[PDB]
Each structure stands twice: as C-alpha cells, then as structure tokens.
Symmetry: C3
Subunit: 428 residues, 3 copies
C-alpha cells in the first residue's frame, strides 16, 4: 500500500531484475570455465583396428587393440591466462550492469507509484469540476423556471457539462492504465496507495550543478561500466599480442597395445616383424611452439584490437556527455518544478478570485454564465497543474539520484516519509 | 480499396513478413545440417611426399605417393543427437516467431487503414468548420454593410477564420502522411478507401476480463514463444551434461601407398627395409573416448546452463506480465471507448443546441459573434472526438484479438462488413 | 556561434562519429587478417620425450629430442579466397555505414541548432506575451482606482497573467534543455548563436516528387548499403558452394631428432634397431582433399544461404519502401510548411486587427477585458506558430537532402547564409 511496501513486494518478484541476476551469476560462474584449460586435462582413448593388406602386401593382416590414459597440462601459454582475466573483467562488467538494473527497478517503481497518484488527482479534480459545473447547471435551471435567467444560460451550461462528462472517461481510463503499469512492474493489483501529504509539502533547492557533476564523474554506474568496458578493450590488445608468444605444454600417458597378425604372408621370410607384440608405454613429454610468421594474421589482429580500443574510448566520451546531459537537465527540471509549484499556487488563488469575480458580474449583468463556467475550468486546470508539478518535482529528485549512481532504499524511505492517508485507485 | 482488398495486396508483397518467412525456412532447413554429423562422412585424401635425410641419415631419400577413401560414422555420441534436437526446437521457436509476424501484418494493416480513415474525418470536419465560420464571416460582412452590427464583429470573425485555414494545412498534411504510412505497409497508393459505416455502427461489451485472460494464457503467441524458449534452455542443460559421457565412433578406409628410395646409403648393410614397398590397406576401427576430468570445464558449463535456465524462466514471467498488461489495458480501453462514444454523442447534441442558443442570443444582444464562433468550434471539436472514439474502439478490438493470439482473416472479414461507401484520400 | 562554426567544432570531437570511424578502420584492417591464410605459415616445433616400456617391452627405454621449421602454403583452396572477398565486401559495407553516420552528424547538428533557436523564440514571445498582459493588468488597476472600470476587470487580468507566468517557466526550461541537447552533440556550451534572418526569409518550391525519388534510388546511403548487403548474401551462397571443391596444399620442413635408448633389453637379440639414431629430414609435400559426401552438410549449408539471400532481397525491398516514405513525406512536409508559413502570416495580421477591435469594443462596452486578453493570447500564439513553421521548413530541407544521400557541408553553408545577428541562449 505505501511506497516502501510496494517496492518490497517488487524486489522479491520482479522478472527483469531476476533475469539480470541470472546473467550476472552466469558470467561469474563462467570464470571457472575460463580457468579450466589452465588445469589438468585427462581423457581415456581406447580403440580396435582390423587391417587387410593387398597389392604387394596381400596376405598380411592385423587386428590391434589400444587403450590409454592421456594427460595435458599448460606450463606457459599466455593466451590461456588472458581468456581468464578477460572473463573476470567480463564478470565485473555484468556486476555493474546488475547494479544498474537494481537502480532501474527503484526508479521505475517510484515513477509508476507516483503516476498512479497523479492519475488519482487528475480524476478527482475532473470530478470536482464535473460537480461544480453541475451545480451551475442546476441553479440555472432553477433560475430559468422562475423567470430570472434566459434559456440560453441553461443551454450553454449543459453543453459545457457534457464536455466534462467525456473528460471523466479519459481521466478514469488513464487511472486504470497507470494501475496496470504498476502491476506490470510489481506483480500485484493495489486497491489503495498512500497519497502524498500535501499539508506537509516543502521543496528544497538542489545541490549546485558542478557539485552534482563532480559526484557523478565519481559514482555514475553507466560510466563505471563504460570505463570497465575500456579496460576490457585494452586487455583485448594484449590478447591479440599473445599470438606472437611461444607456448610450452606437457604430455603424459600410459597406454597398452595388442596386435595379432595372420593370413598367408605372415611367417617365412618375415623374421620376428609379424609375431605378436603386446606393447606397453609410459610417457612424459614437453611440447614447444613459436609462431614466427602466419601471414600477418597477428599484427592485423592487433591493429583491429587497437581501433576497437579507440572505439571503446569514444563510447566513454559518449557515456560522459550522456551523464552531463542527465544531470544538467535534471538540475534544470527540479528548479523549474519548484518554479512551477510556486507559479501554480499563485494561479489557484488568482483563479478562484477570478471565479468569484465572474459570479459577481454575472448577477449584475457584466459577465455571462459562459464567463462563470470558464473561470470554473481555469480554476480546476490550475489545481491539476499544481498537483502535477509536485509529482514532477519528486520524480526529478529520483532522476537526479539515479544520474548520481547513489539511488537506494534510503532514498525511498525519505519519499515514504512524505506520504500519509490512504486513497483508492478505484473510486466512484 | 476496401480493407480485405488492402490486406490481400499486402499479404502477397510485404517485405517484413517475407523476410520472416525466409528466417523460418532457413531454421527449418538447418535441421538437415544438424542431422548431417550423424550420417556417413566420406572424404578422399591423396598426397605426394619427398624426403631428404641428413646428419646420421645422409644418403637415404624417399618419394612416397598415397591415396585413400576415408569414412567416419557416429555410433554413440549424445552431443551429436542434442545438436539435432536443439535445432529442431530452434525451428519450432522460429515458426512461432513467424506466426507472430503474420499477426503483426494483420494488426498493422488494419491500424494503418483506420488511421487513414481517421485523418480523412479530421480534415473533413476541419473543412466543415472552415465553411461554417466562413458563412458567419460572410453574413457579418453583409450585416455590417447594411448597418446592423459593428466592424468589430467582422474583424473578430476574420481572425478566427484565419486560424481555421491554418488548421486545415495541418489536417491535410496528417492525411498525406498516413496515406504514406499505409503505402509503406502495403506497397500501393490508394486513391480511395471504404469508409466506416456510421449509419450501422453499434458497439458490443467485451467478454469479461478473466475469460479473456484465460484465453490468452492458452493461445497468446508471445508466451507460446517464451515457453518454447524455456524448453530450449532446459535442453541446453542436457547438452552441457553430455560433456561427461563417453563417445563411440567407427573408422573405415581403403588406401594405397608407393615409396621408392634412392641415393647413397640405400643398399649394402640395409637389408630389405629400403627396397620398394607398394602397400595396400583396408581398415575398420572403433574409437572410444571418456573424459574423466577437463579442469571442471563441464560442470561449470552445466552451472552456466542452469542459471541461463532460471533466466529463461524469468523471461517467461516477463512475457506473462506483459500480456496480462496488454489484455487488461485493452479491456479497459474498449470499455472507455464505448463510454466515450456515448459521451460525445450526447456532447454533439448539447453543442449544437448551445450553438443555436448563442445565435439566438447574438440577435438580442446577450451574446456576441465571439460566443457564436466559439460554439461552432466546440461543436466541431465534439464531432471529431466522436469519430476518433469509433476508430479507437475498433483498434482496440484488434489489439485484444492480437493479445488473445487468434487474430486472423475471419476477424478482418468482420471489420470489412462494417465498411461501405467509397471516400477519397485526396479531396479538395 | 554560427551554424558553420558549431558543426566544425562538432566534426572534430563527436564520439558517435569517431567510433564509427574506428569500426570502419577495423573492418578495413581485417582485410589483412583475411589474406593471411593465403600467405606462408611458418612455425617452429621442438619437443623432448621420455618413454618407459613395460609388459612385453619392459627394459627398453628412450629419450628423444626433436626440433623443426614447419611451412604451410595454400595452392588451391577456394574457401580461403572467399573469406578474403567476403571481408573486402564487409569493409565496403562498413565504409557506407561510415558515410551514413557522417551524414547523421550534419543532420543532427543542424536539427539541434535550430531547436535552440526555436526555443529562444518561444521564450521570447512568451515574454512578449507576459509584458502585453502585464500592461493590461497595470492599466486596469489604474482605471480601477480612479472609478472607470470595475474590480472584476482587475481580477480577470491577474488570473490570466498568472497563467502566462507559469508558461514562462516551462518555455525557459525547454530552452535550457535544448541547449543541453546541443552540448551532447557538440561538446560545447554556447552562450549565443546566430539567429535566423527573418527580414531576408523566402521559401522555394521543392523539386517535383518523382525527380527527388529518382535521385534517391541512385544516391541514398541506406539503400546503397542494402544493395551491398545483397551482394554479400550472394557471395555467401558461393562460400557454401565451396565446401564441395577439392583442396591442394603444400608442406615443407627441416627437422632434427636425437633418441638415446637405455636399460636392460637394449643389446643382444636387438641387432642395430636400438642403437643411437640421430636423424635429419628435409620435406616438400603436396596434400589433396576432396569431400564427396559429408552427410548433406554442404547442400543444406547452400540452401540456408539461398534463403538468407531472399532475406536480404526483402531487406532491400524494405529499405526502398522506407526511403520512398522519407522522401514522399518530406516533400509533403515541405509544401505544408510553406502553406503554414503563408497561413500564419495572414493570421498574425488578422489577429492584431482583432486585438485592436477588442480594445475599441472594450472602451464602448461591447467587449470585456476578457476579450482583450484572449485576443492578446491568440496574437502571440499565431506569432509562435509562424516562427515554428520556418524552423519546420528548414529541418525538412535537411531531411530531404539526407533522404537524397547528398547532405554535405555545402548544404550547411547555404543554411548558414540565412543567418545573421547574435541572440542569447540565456537571457532574462
């Protein structure tokens, strides 16, 4: 029901978040799959061959049976150590994108929570407008019946009451759809939420724009990732450079091997060479490989990886500009929101005083019913505007913390302290 | 020209649908390329080697000539059978993707078709509004000349007639551009379409929301795909688990091989071993391989696939939530659309009668030309809003069938039975 | 400060463009790595093996050491020449996507530049509007005090001024944020730009739409790329057809190998074959390989690439339709913008004359202060719409050149010649 409670329910069950957690876990586990080629490799081979000679070897025939435990082990292969740090850096990237999504859920939940409250205020003021204009229509009907105003006053009022009835269908649909927006992010249907406390409402100026810019160069999660993704591209130059290096491996086996010969040219003038061997071997070998020249394959692989590096350096300058914009435009939006709140507060007062003036003039002949119903509209538009600005103010508080990198449950606790009484998401 | 006609022409030539069909066809044929490793492999090798011994083998030299038909055949290899089932499941996913896109074309054509109709109505009404305001301007001009109204009445009318001539440029532009939207989907330019029959227009309450939900958990194609994609991730656990199993292959060959020796140390104290061999061989072997230990490569490959399965299970909770949204918010939009249709019908009535009331009042001095022109605007604004609600109603029937999974040509035939007389997409 | 100068500073330092340049450079360099396997391969192998015989060869034991220069050399391998042409065409594709991005930077820079200008006009008109209505409120408050006009006039004026105060906050925020849009594309904050010259403003009819469609079928960058991507898919059929072809390689080596035997069954009944070999080898060989049958692997690989060809043939029909839309709707938007410019010109005139008429009416009792205020609003709304259409006009000049393929720095020079005096992006 309150926002703390809505986010708690959302944190346990959200599929976009829990998917992200799965991607992070896979990437961390894959760390092990990248260590594995640096550890003992141990397979058992085991065949059976039947040969049958012909043409100048006709009459000599075998069948062999082999079986062996084989063992490989890297001693020096830098490309195998690279695949390991490259997959540890990849898991570091995924861990930051997880932190980004954890933050997205906070933002999107608060945003959707406030949208529903906004939609409750739009409909509640559209209903207050409906009722005020109906009051006019009813009292004009009374006044017409007794001879005091003309039929025109009634007809004008009705037309304008009909407009408001149709605006209420829109108002109500927007509310049902915002409630469904919420259910998508949350899993639950909420019959009521905790409304923003309007008698306790104050705003505070933001921190100066450079203080916020400094904090974001330090802590923004999108540009931690961009930086990590630049590390990754540099270590990818190093992996390319490794194709030049020599490799030093180790083999080990323990294999048996039968072999029985038979047929016509197997004895007489052979001499021991086609008997029965029943061999047996234990090996330990060291392999050594030095590339020298593969067509310029390495080199071009290195130059590719160098360009990829400037590429990732540009994506870092892209992510910086992107955060410059989010923070500076958030700063501006907050300021503007404060400015709007004050502007629309003033507006409501003037609008009501205008409405009171219309009604006065109506009764002495210097304004019409049309003027009165217009001033009723102005009033309720101003009110709606006011409520809309307060929600914009708070959403922009959240967008700023988001752009900082620091948006968490403490920030949501603060917002929850500005809420109070229950309000229904499905009234009449 | 009618909607059935417009979709018929669009089904045969639409590029986004015909590419999807090519994606489906490629994934189905790739079933063959996944079977191929479980079938006979048959290559012909054939070399010519020239050796030249030195240092403690100086003076012994050969030239060898070989040639062989080789044959491989899988007897037991579980990972080869998986690759086949995994590409069968992939073509099953791609066939749903295709059914999804076959649906998008229906939805997208019907939507674009009604958008054109919508824009014809907006411009039609703007023109009706232009002509009504003109009539006012004309008759005010006449009355001014003859001494019955002030010049202020003419000036006021001309200002408001100018505003509407500018609105006409934008309504005409929107029409041109939605005609272009439709040519993109359709291939053709249409000089006329079948307009919505508004004489025969009735709306119907939708089925209750739970019945629609039930129907969509059964038949929605986005979530058939998410389910098949969860099956795929489970079979991917199995493919990883296969790295543990032993493999049993089969070899077969028939190979010739010459070899003539030559030079200094090839006779005297050799004894038969450096003569002319003219070998000949027929083989049939069975290989056997059991892994035992590869560094924990398998296992971590299995744990990766286990997490990627929780991931696909979250994407299945994601696509459920998103179809619960699409149906709930379509059922809301449809009810609201009917409500709006009723509200604006009643509005057009009161608007007309409030316009007659202004005209009455203008002639006895209790309203101005300004109120008359305003009431003319209110009137046309409501008619536009009513036409727009009818389109909104039908578009939402379409979106709900789409979220159901069952949007087809019979649905499009129903909508086409609600059309009638031809209306131009480029009038004046 | 001017548009030429803003784009110059943008062209040097834009991250999106410079990254695209890095992708192009990597694709062109990778041409080298695709030639590499058609060129001499040359590695140095060198082991040390220690054997230990048992069961029916117990007592016979070796240690061998080898070392060799190995050389590979392609003589006939069609699929190796394919990977070369296929990476050449990929670089051709990437070079066109670079040309496309070079174009996007011009378009996005001119768009963002005029967006700032437009937001400067909105704010400056909203300010003009504020002042006009303030003059009204002041002059009514004056009249109120000396008994000429009632209280009601003051109250209506105030309410309406409040509304315009509020509009100012948002008009100023839109400008700050369009300034921010420009810093993202640009790197720089600009305290002033060169304003559109409105004294010298003329529009020109565009070229006929078929003429512009013809020029775009020839030169559009998105559909050169779709065409190149069709070529690439055809060459991809050819690469699969290569799996059928025979391969002709060449080997060469120069290898030493020691081997010292030892232990008990080493002498007596051996006879020469367990002494000390110190071998030496020079080879030059020719390998030959012909597929015949791999399970229908090739064939299905060819069928897959045939379907992938019709796919890219459909993406070509898609990109054609998409530029038929961008040119035709740009032609339509240009004409309509011209039409708008004309209609709002005339609207300002009539609106000012209507305002003059409301004033005159107010002083003789046939209109109220509410009419005068309303007519002030109408006037400023028309002026805003006129400014807006001029920017619209020029942006669509830009969008059409981009749809043609020919958008360059000459086009940006022409637009810069339609600019003049400095105007501030942060006034008061």
């Amino acid at each position: 029901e309150n926002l703390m409670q809505v986010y708690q329910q959302a944190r346990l069950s959200n599929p976009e978040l829990r998917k992200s957690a799965a991607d992070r876990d896979a990437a961390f586990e894959k760390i092990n799959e990248a260590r594995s080629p640096l550890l003992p490799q141990l397979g058992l081979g085991a065949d059976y061959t039947y040969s049958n000679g012909y043409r100048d070897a006709n009459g000599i025939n075998s069948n062999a049976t082999s079986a062996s435990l084989q063992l490989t082990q890297s001693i020096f292969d830098m490309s195998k150590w690279r695949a390991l740090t490259l997959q540890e850096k990849a898991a570091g990237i995924q861990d930051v994108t997880y932190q980004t999504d954890q933050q997205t859920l906070i933002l999107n939940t608060a945003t959707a929570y406030f949208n529903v409250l906004n939609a409750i205020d739009v409909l509640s003021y559209t209903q207050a407008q409906k009722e005020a204009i109906y009051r006019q229509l009813d009292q004009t009907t009374q006044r017409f019946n007794v001879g005091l105003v003309a039929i025109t006053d009634v007809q004008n009022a009705r037309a304008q009451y009909d407009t408001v009835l149709a605006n209420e269908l829109t108002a109500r649909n927007n509310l049902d759809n915002a409630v469904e927006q919420l259910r998508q992010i949350t899993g639950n249907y909420y019959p009521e939420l905790a409304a923003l406390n309007v008698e306790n409402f104050k705003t505070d100026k933001p921190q100066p724009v450079n203080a916020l810019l400094k904090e974001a160069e330090k802590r923004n999660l999108s540009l931690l990732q961009a930086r990590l993704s630049q590390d990754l591209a540099r270590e990818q130059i190093r992996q390319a450079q490794d194709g030049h290096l020599p490799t030093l491996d180790l083999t080990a086996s323990t294999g048996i091997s039968d072999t029985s010969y038979s047929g016509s040219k197997t004895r007489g003038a052979a001499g021991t060479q086609y008997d029965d061997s029943n061999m047996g071997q234990n090996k330990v070998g060291l392999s050594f490989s030095l590339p020298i020249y593969q067509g310029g394959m390495v080199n071009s692989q290195v130059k590719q990886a160098q360009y990829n590096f400037v590429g990732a350096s540009e994506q870092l300058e892209s992510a910086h500009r992107s955060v410059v914009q989010t923070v500076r435009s958030s700063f501006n939006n907050i300021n503007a929101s404060i400015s709007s709140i004050n502007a629309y507060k003033q507006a409501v007062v003037s609008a009501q005083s205008s409405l009171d003036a219309m009604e006065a003039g109506y009764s002495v002949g210097t304004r019409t019913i049309v003027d009165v119903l217009d001033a009723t509209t102005t009033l309720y538009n101003a009110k709606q505007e006011l409520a809309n600005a307060r929600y914009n103010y708070l959403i922009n508080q959240l967008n700023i913390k988001s752009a900082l990198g620091t948006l968490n449950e403490q920030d949501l606790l603060a917002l929850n302290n500005a809420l109070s009484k229950p309000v229904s998401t499905n009234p009449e």
